[PDB]
Amino acid sequence: QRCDWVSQDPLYIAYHDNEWGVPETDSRKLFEMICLEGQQAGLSWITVLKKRENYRACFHQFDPIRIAAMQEEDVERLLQNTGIIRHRGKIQAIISNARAWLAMEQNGESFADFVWSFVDGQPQITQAASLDKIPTSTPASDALAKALKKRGFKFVGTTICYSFMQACGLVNDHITGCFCHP
Numbered sequence: 001q002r003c004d005w006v007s008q009d010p011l012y013i014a015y016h017d018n019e020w021g022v023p024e025t026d027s028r029k030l031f032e033m034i035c036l037e038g039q040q041a042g043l044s045w046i047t048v049l050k051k052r053e054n055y056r057a058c059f060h061q062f063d064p065i066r067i068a069a070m071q072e073e074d075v076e077r078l079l080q081n082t083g084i085i086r087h088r089g090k091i092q093a094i095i096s097n098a099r100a101w102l103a104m105e106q107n108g109e110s111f112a113d114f115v116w117s118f119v120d121g122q123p124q125i126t127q128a129a130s131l132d133k134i135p136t137s138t139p140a141s142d143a144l145a146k147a148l149k150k151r152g153f154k155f156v157g158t159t160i161c162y163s164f165m166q167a168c169g170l171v172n173d174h175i176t177g178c179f180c181h182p
């Protein structure tokens with residue numbers, strides 16, 4: 001059995017089976033996922049997942065240095081790229097997020113340490129047997145959203161942050177029946 005929210009799409013099955021809820025501790029990889037999670041605001045994950053390679057291609061493999069140097073002209077070219085989400089606020093958010101991440105990392109602050117601090121450094125494993133008993137935001141995601149906003153990140157509302165926590169294994173929200181549950 002798998003989590004009920006997975007579709008029959010093999011791209012999504014692989015994502016569920018191999019990536020979702022798996023603890024991620026690399027700062028750059030965490031950066032990529034907070035960005036991809038913000039791109040999904042108002043949309044479904046499959047839309048963003050199917051576009052992930054396109055994002056990696058026009059955002060310099062989520063290297064924050066190169067992204068941070070992007071300007072209005074880059075935003076305008078990206079707004080013409082049908083392989084990503086053509087939404088000005090969403091494109092600008094990736095650029096703001098790169099700059100925000102750089103300002104932390106250059107000040108000696110690991111982004112990985114930062115996000116992991118909100119779950120006390122340890123994956124929180126669910127006891128829910130059904131998706132209805134799994135929240136979409138928590139006090140911890142509220143705290144992470146407030147901190148990210150204060151530090152200059154964009155498209156990081158509390159629901160986005162909780163999805164990010166799930167995706168990157170800060171919480172493990174596979175249902176207890178799922179073969180991926182501990």
Ligand SMILES: [Zn+2]
Pocket residue numbers: 002003016173174175178179180181
């Ligand atoms: Zn699962």
